[PDB]
Amino acid sequence: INFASLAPRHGSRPFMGNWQDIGTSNMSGGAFSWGSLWKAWNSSTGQMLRDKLKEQNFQQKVVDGLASGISGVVDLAN
Amino acid sequence: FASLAPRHGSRPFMGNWQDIGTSNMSGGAFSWGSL
Amino acid sequence: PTHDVTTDRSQRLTLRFIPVDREDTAYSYKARFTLAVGDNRVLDMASTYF
Amino acid sequence: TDPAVRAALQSQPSGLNSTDDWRQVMDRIMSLTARNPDAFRQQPQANRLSAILEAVVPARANPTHEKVLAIVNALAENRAIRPDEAGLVYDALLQRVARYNSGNVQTNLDRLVGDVREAVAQRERAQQQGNLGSMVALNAFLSTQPANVPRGQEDYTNFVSALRLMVTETPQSEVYQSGPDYFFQTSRQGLQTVNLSQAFKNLQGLWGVRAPTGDRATVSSLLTPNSRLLLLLIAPFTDSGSVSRDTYLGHLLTLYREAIGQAHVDEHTFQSLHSLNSEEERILRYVQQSVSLNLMRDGVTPSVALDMTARNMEPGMYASNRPFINRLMDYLHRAAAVNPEYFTNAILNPHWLPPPGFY
Incomplete structure (x- = not known):
């Protein structure tokens, strides 16, 4: 009775997730990551478009799926 | 061991053994967090 | 850490290489560089650029 | 800490x-x-x-x-x-x-x-x-009590020694004086408080004359319930023969002692020889799949099918499990040579296991 064969294998080693992860959330005291980070009267054109581009995309730190990027330092916005 | 590491304490600062890595566009990812 | 990180010997950080050969055609281009590495160091190719 | x-x-x-x-x-x-x-x-x-x-x-x-x-x-x-x-x-x-x-x-x-x-x-x-203070209080109280009983004396002093032993042998028990009386609490913040002075006053008249009258419940109402609790608390102490038997006091003590006894005692009492390893099962399923595939889509003979399966194996695992794989291949070979129906059934039906005697 071992279920390791069902899991994805990360190379001679099953990819067993942390057992400490079973959901629990309520009104106060429960906070989850990935927060809400974010005819022109004004013709600047430029920053405007750029800003719209920014508005449609993303950035944060626990986004560590895969890799952070080369040489390093550990930072915030936890 | 290693003496070549930043030491934030008397104890050395060393990451996880398992740190070497991969991703193919594929979706061979779409995988979870560092946590 | 102090020891075993940075060599005390004089060592360039950035090297500039001259193209030892360059043959041009009416539409294309060609360059050959003699990429040299010091005998006691390692080069990460990602930093190399034209 | x-x-x-x-x-x-x-x-x-x-x-x-x-x-x-x-x-x-x-x-x-x-x-x-x-x-x-x-x-x-x-x-x-x-x-x-x-x-x-x-x-x-x-x-x-x-x-x-x-x-x-x-x-x-x-x-x-x-x-x-x-x-x-x-x-x-x-x-x-x-x-x-x-x-x-x-x-x-x-x-x-x-x-x-x-x-x-x-x-x-x-x-x-x-x-x-053992809290010597309780012992001191009890000795003071006993000095207050008289040491002479006109009707019977051996039972009285035996009981006094039994009480002394009880208060000594169980720490956390409290003996003190609050009013013009002495008491005995079996534990701090605990129930079962016995009015010791009243209990002794009531029991003074029942020491040496309740032996002949124990058979008739004519004087049984003389025992105030507080003294009954006092006797109950000394059942584990004052073992048989300490208090003369055939006495109402002795009869009660013996009954209580027997009861508590059965209880603690009961309470402390309270209340196919070879089968394959997962790796070998994986190998078996792979062999089944490969042999079935070759035999069904390429039409090759069963012997050649077994040979073709073997080669395509990972060399490390093939060498590591050389004996088991060799034995399985030989068994399947002779099965396919002898009993084609059994071979086809055993090569096509999952949940199949090698029968005993194959070992």
């Missing part, structure tokens, strides 16, 4: 593996430690130098706070003061010492920390030893 006020203190005023224990640091810095040698040889320079500089010339320390905190913590764990009073009295004592300090004062302070350590240990062991 720890009761020893020295230990429960020294967790508070102390680093971790500093030069307070110089010998361990000096052992670790050269090479002497065997658990993990060459640890110190490869630290950054500053740290190394600093320890060394600390090691050759130690730096003096002021132990006044440690000793004062030790004695304060001893007072706290001994119910001398409340914990808030502990926080206050620490500063109070610190000021007292600081405004009268001398070498003699430090010497007396060391003497005092030793004394309070011993005092806490003694108080704990005495509280777990």
